Design an enzyme around this catalytic site. Structure first.
Site, short mmCIF file in Angstrom:
data_model
loop_
_atom_site.label_atom_id
_atom_site.label_comp_id
_atom_site.label_asym_id
_atom_site.label_seq_id
_atom_site.Cartn_x
_atom_site.Cartn_y
_atom_site.Cartn_z
NE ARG A 59 -3.18 0.42 3.18
CZ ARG A 59 -2.68 0.73 4.31
NH1 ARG A 59 -2.16 1.99 4.49
NH2 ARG A 59 -2.37 0.00 5.36
CE1 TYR A 112 -15.92 9.42 -17.12
CE2 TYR A 112 -14.91 9.64 -15.06
CZ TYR A 112 -15.66 8.97 -16.16
OH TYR A 112 -16.01 7.77 -15.80
CG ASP A 184 -7.70 14.24 -16.20
OD1 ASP A 184 -7.16 13.36 -17.15
OD2 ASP A 184 -8.78 13.64 -15.92
CE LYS A 209 -10.82 5.87 -19.36
NZ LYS A 209 -11.86 4.94 -19.44
C1 LIG Z 1 -10.49 12.43 -18.53
C2 LIG Z 1 -10.61 11.57 -17.74
N1 LIG Z 1 -10.18 11.38 -16.67
C3 LIG Z 1 -10.43 10.92 -15.69
C4 LIG Z 1 -11.12 9.48 -15.83
C5 LIG Z 1 -11.38 8.50 -14.48
O1 LIG Z 1 -10.55 7.39 -14.93
P1 LIG Z 1 -10.73 5.89 -14.14
O2 LIG Z 1 -11.23 5.99 -12.99
O3 LIG Z 1 -12.29 5.43 -15.26
O4 LIG Z 1 -9.82 5.22 -14.87
C6 LIG Z 1 -11.68 9.38 -17.22
C7 LIG Z 1 -12.52 8.27 -17.52
N2 LIG Z 1 -13.32 8.41 -18.77
C8 LIG Z 1 -14.17 7.32 -19.21
C9 LIG Z 1 -14.64 6.31 -18.34
O5 LIG Z 1 -15.42 5.29 -18.91
N3 LIG Z 1 -15.74 6.30 -20.40
C10 LIG Z 1 -14.77 7.45 -20.27
O6 LIG Z 1 -14.73 8.32 -21.23
C11 LIG Z 1 -11.46 10.22 -18.16
O7 LIG Z 1 -11.93 10.44 -19.35
C1 LIG Z 2 -7.25 -4.61 11.19
C2 LIG Z 2 -6.67 -4.20 10.04
N1 LIG Z 2 -7.61 -3.26 9.33
C3 LIG Z 2 -7.25 -2.71 8.28
C4 LIG Z 2 -5.91 -2.76 7.79
C5 LIG Z 2 -5.83 -1.84 6.41
O1 LIG Z 2 -5.52 -3.04 5.37
P1 LIG Z 2 -4.73 -2.88 4.02
O2 LIG Z 2 -5.14 -1.50 3.64
O3 LIG Z 2 -3.18 -2.73 4.74
O4 LIG Z 2 -5.07 -3.90 3.36
C6 LIG Z 2 -4.90 -3.41 8.32
C7 LIG Z 2 -3.58 -3.46 7.99
N2 LIG Z 2 -2.82 -4.34 9.03
C8 LIG Z 2 -1.48 -4.33 8.71
C9 LIG Z 2 -0.74 -3.71 7.65
O5 LIG Z 2 0.32 -3.78 7.85
N3 LIG Z 2 0.67 -4.61 9.25
C10 LIG Z 2 -0.43 -4.67 9.74
O6 LIG Z 2 -0.82 -5.28 10.91
C11 LIG Z 2 -5.34 -4.12 9.84
O7 LIG Z 2 -4.68 -5.04 10.54
#
Ligand SMILES: Cc1ncc(COP(=O)(O)O)c(C/N=C2\CONC2=O)c1O
Ligand SMILES: Cc1ncc(COP(=O)(O)O)c(C/N=C2\CONC2=O)c1O
Ligand SMILES: Cc1ncc(COP(=O)(O)O)c(C/N=C2\CONC2=O)c1O
Ligand SMILES: Cc1ncc(COP(=O)(O)O)c(C/N=C2\CONC2=O)c1O
Ligand SMILES: [Cl-]
Ligand SMILES: [Cl-]
Ligand SMILES: [Cl-]
Ligand SMILES: [Cl-]
Lengths: 396, 396, 396, 396
Positions: A59, A112, A184, A209
């Site tokens: 992460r 968008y 963007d 894209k």
């Molecule tokens: C300019 C632009 N910015 C951001 C996004 C967001 O991206 P994503 O989270 O989908 O990766 C899109 C998605 N454009 C789309 C998504 O579906 N049709 C479209 O023209 C976009 O066209």
């Molecule tokens: C109870 C609990 N909730 C949520 C998360 C968040 O999850 P993630 O976004 O990492 O998938 C962790 C991560 N626990 C960790 C992460 O690194 N060491 C740990 O004990 C966790 O232990």
């Protein structure tokens, strides 16, 4: 021996990547892991302190994803990159990192849809107000700025009709008032437009894209100064959005981005041809493409973009029903949302994405009954033109 | 012929999954796509309207990810699931969907560090206040509730010393005051604890831990009522966090979760043995494990959990230096953060994760100089015990 | 600190694997590459000469695949491993490496169908003759050996009726006459049977079955002395079959094999229960399972196998039509070929795999009209028993 | 609406692929499964009989792999395709399917090393004799044919010095004598050469090279008449080599092949430029490239190939030591075996691959002390030329 000194095609292939140090493997290994093992308690502390380099947990960061982040930083001429779960998550991780209750954003209107929905409905509920303007008129941007304004937010070209925004001019304005400019750059890719070089502070992409290019990854990337990217990583992503990219997604995006130069060349060569075809067709009322000299911001587009892009919008004679007939009549072009895939994609927002929305909001929104959006692929353009010609002839 | 009627092991294997309809492929296909093609403009509109079923675009939903979401809904006895980019993104997508400026959350103090950082530093900057309490004392939860309180947030067992929270009692309290109860069930998995059955409204997991089980996916999942999950998907995820799961990540998580029952049995059989060993060792001052009858909430743990879990915390004689000596002396256990992998993992928060943090915040935080956290894997427990015995003997 | 010294469960988890040296990544990186880059011409020559260690090209070897090969060598107590594209390719790479025109093989008759087809029809066309015998009668093996005999080839348990072959006795016989003993150990896995420990020279597996365990990989593995494995790699695989494993396939197989111990325990616990159920059912004429004391080689099975396996064959009253009715009536068990998946699989060779084959070859072949083969999964056995009970009641 | 009617670029993108039928997913789903579930015993029998269509088990066939097989059949203008574990396995599956004890093959001498080793050392040990000739002299092919000759085997261009073989002329000769012509088309891809159109019976590729294009897959493909491909699948692959392709490998190869046209254009544009550079360099004695008019078979190359390829061989002044100096001095080009990756790769067979082989076999083999092989990538050619210029200047 530094990534940043070679030609742009060489950078697309090599930047951010090198043979695996332990084995010599040429392909970036997929580090599809959650965690990383320390040599000692000491090594572990050093890292967490942020007092030494190396990995801790996916992460926070990962070797495969780092390669992608470094590559895209090189291509945008930015200091640092941060990959995300999606383009949306690139935009939100950025803005939620920058802004807090009481802050203000000036945004383009011609953005968008899902971005618009976040800014219109969600931001204000966290006490962050957004003023929307026509960003093709830099005076509207200036007039909407407030002492609380942290960010000016733009897309160029813009998603319906490929109108443009003068990045250098808007940057100057935002900076004069102490705000950051976020651009963007999804529609263009770094191969065609470099907002940082024109004064933007932060670039975001949906890599879904053209950067990935292969229609098989949802992902985003943010490029900017190291001090901003660190906060975006260690607060925005780590704590707020949780929007980390899968290492497999990064690996694919690295793979897809290898052919960015040659894909963009072909997409744009194809699109220019198709756009000229559509401009000479008596059944087509308008064609929106930056590469046509009738584009109202044609010369800005020539200064700011190296190629005119792979996206074409156009209106078919007969409005809604004819647009619906047309998209049901294509045999090669594929009906879908998204863009920047190797396949040609087509969408008729009025009969598809916006059929339950009133004729009136649609027009406000830049969206006419006959508006079709076309994402030009890598097929033979004669085939695409013939498919279009056939579908248009039938529809009208 | 309904997923929900079979035994729990059968559900772990089959729920949410079926042979591919077009080919009969037994493994859930990896639908590693960004978009989906419509048969017609009409089909497309129907979907976007939310007036018909089927897929549109992977950020919104995907067939592979849906299988995972349905499976985990079945296992938690909830209506619906939503997969996310990470456990953090499950928690934030949930809370940012539920809460807006002016709202309040009552949270346990004894929670995962990054969760704590989001609630402590980020939430308040969006005008959402958080009151932290000792959730092992349900009266503290009641006393902190306010008219603005939307959510009570708990983990059980809790991440340092595996203290517990009475889910049924806390649920009753939250509901009495018109709040929802969110339970992070990561440590237990649905195989060992089912918060919805005890009155919780929403369960969240980091699937990175035991649900995936294989140390190779970062992901999260949220389970709850369909009306909440829809908002979490179509607003929280779509617009705010952007925290969608990769279909490859979902596929792996589906693969990992197949062995959840047999993994949890072994993890817990192994951990009980190790915990008994650690309790008889003259160099170990304390052992925190729900399966030891000296655990201060032992009988609650017997009512609420089907097994006592795979995680053990313990303090070694001699504080910081001895804990550092100990973790540098293990040859089999691996030094790393994370838990719920097939490998045994060990971390000494005072010399590793918390070395630059003052002895004083650490204690506040439940973290003593000699505190070691152990994630028990699937190795032979005699081997793990011998590795521990050797490392402890050396350190003291 | 040597893989080979720990308990068997610890070996299943750890053998052949370690944290990535360059990053500490816990999961074995997927080295999904074709080639490997040399530091110098000198480094390159050293490797090709076979005068130094390291990688060259994925057909020859790969870091991910090496981990799998080392793990399985450890588990079988062999010197070296070699992964292949499939179980068939493990068997053919082995036999085509060992044998040339004029050579002879003595094979069990009761073997996997595709193996039988290779030995019956293809081998002789390369001038390599094969004599088939009932390998449950070690005297038939002895009587068929010739001065040209290079190899004796056996499976145990054997694929129709789970008859056994006395590995130690057959090994002694083969060796007395100067031949090698090859044992296909697919049905048992190294967790349940170790042919090398009993005198076999080479073990082969389809890892598609229990070693991977998850129904999502086709692959094979060969384990034996280093001098044989080198020839199998640098001639058999490199030149003759070309049957290299994908690094992604190896990665999955490594992932699947982590839970081998706990999967085999559950498969076998489940199967014993199901087998006892089937033995008490008045509609079931015969049940073939090594764990039933009526098995004609029960005591050999107790000496040679640590558990009686996950596979059960049985005959249903009423022959062909009743077997067809039965398999069309199961709602939980899945109709498919293959075995060793987490799901319960069922096949009725007479109405499925062998419907166009004459009633007469089938019987020769050990295959009666009512013979059903059942691969027991990880579901609740009560559910599987109820599904069977229901299907059997209906069919008869 | 038939794959085979569109332009070649359109075919590269679309042939063999369509949206997933059950979901509309645009990307070909990764069917990473071992087995397939039947609706009934009846459905199962129908398939095994080869009396109905659909899937059974991934070694026999798979939906993802079928897409790749159909695409490449379209691109080569053949009836059917069969994917394999490697290029070697494509060649061996083919020849071991065609040939049996007593048969004869006439092969080019100027072939890939591992192919040479199979034909020289392994084939004869199965009673299949091979006569090697200079295939640039079609009279040598004719003179070596025997009544037992089943196959004539050629590569063009050929792997050391890119000499050519007149496919149409050789085909006519082979057919006159009742033999089949097998052409390994790896160096060219179907984008640049189509052996079936010139009379070849069967084409084989290592897809590891330009068809995949991304240096991350080992795989092969065989294209030919359906009656041959069926035998190659149901005997060669099923029984003899076991050399099936992983569905993930096929998926990647499908992904890589999307950009085949644009990659080949760039590879060849780049290589022509580099080759002209090398031809004018006073330190370079010879340059072997089909696109240079001094190539001794230049005009054949113009008739048979649409572009002159991405591979260049050349001799540097000063023989062995200078070739070793040169390859240790490149900073951009990567030292590795393999070709057809997006990266520029270089190998000096005399100091690398062939250092322990006597100066005398090397020359026999076409391999001089100063011979360097260069696989031109997609970088800026000015960068590659500068890297070469620098390395050459240093070495000489
Ligand atoms: C300019 C632009 N910015 C951001 C996004 C967001 O991206 P994503 O989270 O989908 O990766 C899109 C998605 N454009 C789309 C998504 O579906 N049709 C479209 O023209 C976009 O066209
Ligand atoms: C109870 C609990 N909730 C949520 C998360 C968040 O999850 P993630 O976004 O990492 O998938 C962790 C991560 N626990 C960790 C992460 O690194 N060491 C740990 O004990 C966790 O232990
Ligand atoms: C004992 C045994 N050996 C080798 C193989 C060959 O392995 P593969 O090449 O398929 O990985 C199988 C396949 N057994 C199958 C295959 O389909 N149904 C079965 O019972 C087998 O059961
Ligand atoms: C022409 C040609 N045919 C077949 C193969 C075999 O393909 P594989 O089994 O490796 O996929 C190669 C490999 N050429 C290599 C392999 O390493 N360096 C080379 O020039 C080749 O160049
Ligand atoms: Cl086009
Ligand atoms: Cl353990
Ligand atoms: Cl069962
Ligand atoms: Cl180049």
């Amino acid at each position: 021996s530094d990534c940043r000194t070679y030609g742009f095609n060489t950078q697309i292939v090599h930047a951010g990547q090198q043979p695996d140090p332990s084995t010599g493997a040429l392909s970036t290994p997929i580090f599809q892991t959650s965690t990383f093992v320390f040599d000692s308690a000491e090594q572990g502390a050093a890292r967490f302190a942020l007092e030494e380099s190396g990995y801790i947990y996916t992460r926070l960061g990962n070797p495969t994803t780092d390669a992608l982040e470094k590559k895209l930083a090189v291509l945008e001429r930015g200091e640092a990159g941060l990959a995300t779960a999606s383009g949306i998550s690139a935009i939100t991780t950025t803005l939620l990192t920058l802004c807090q209750q009481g802050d203000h954003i000036v945004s383009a209107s011609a953005i968008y849809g899902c971005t618009h929905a976040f800014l219109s409905h969600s931001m204000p509920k966290f006490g962050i107000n957004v003023s929307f303007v026509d960003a093709a008129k830099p005076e509207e941007i200036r007039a909407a700025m407030r002492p609380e304004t942290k960010v000016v937010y733009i897309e160029t070209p813009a998603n319906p009709t490929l109108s443009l925004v003068d990045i250098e001019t808007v940057a100057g304005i935002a900076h004069q008032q102490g705000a950051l400019l976020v651009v963007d750059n999804t529609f263009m890719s770094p191969y065609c437009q470099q907002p940082l070089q024109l004064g933007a502070d932060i670039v975001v992409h949906s890599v879904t894209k053209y950067i990935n290019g292969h229609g098989d990854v949802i992902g985003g990337i943010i490029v900017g100064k190291q001090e901003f990217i660190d906060q975006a990583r260690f607060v925005g992503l780590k704590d707020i959005t949780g929007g980390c990219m899968s290492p497999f997604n990064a690996w694919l995006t690295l793979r897809g981005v290898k052919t960015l130069g040659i894909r963009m060349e072909r997409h744009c060569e194809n699109a220019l041809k198709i756009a000229r075809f559509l401009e000479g067709h008596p059944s087509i009322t308008r064609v929106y493409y930056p590469g046509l000299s009738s584009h109202p911001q044609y010369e800005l587009g020539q200064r700011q973009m190296s190629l005119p892009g792979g996206i074409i919008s156009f209106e078919i004679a007969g409005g809604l029903e004819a647009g619906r007939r047309m998209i049901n009549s294509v045999e090669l072009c594929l009906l879908a949302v998204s863009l920047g895939d190797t396949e040609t994609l087509i969408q008729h927002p009025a009969s598809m994405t916006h059929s339950p929305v009133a004729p009136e909001e649609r027009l406000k929104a830049g969206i006419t009954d006959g508006l079709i959006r076309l994402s030009v692929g890598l097929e033979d353009p004669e085939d695409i033109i013939n498919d279009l010609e056939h579908a248009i002839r039938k529809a009208t």
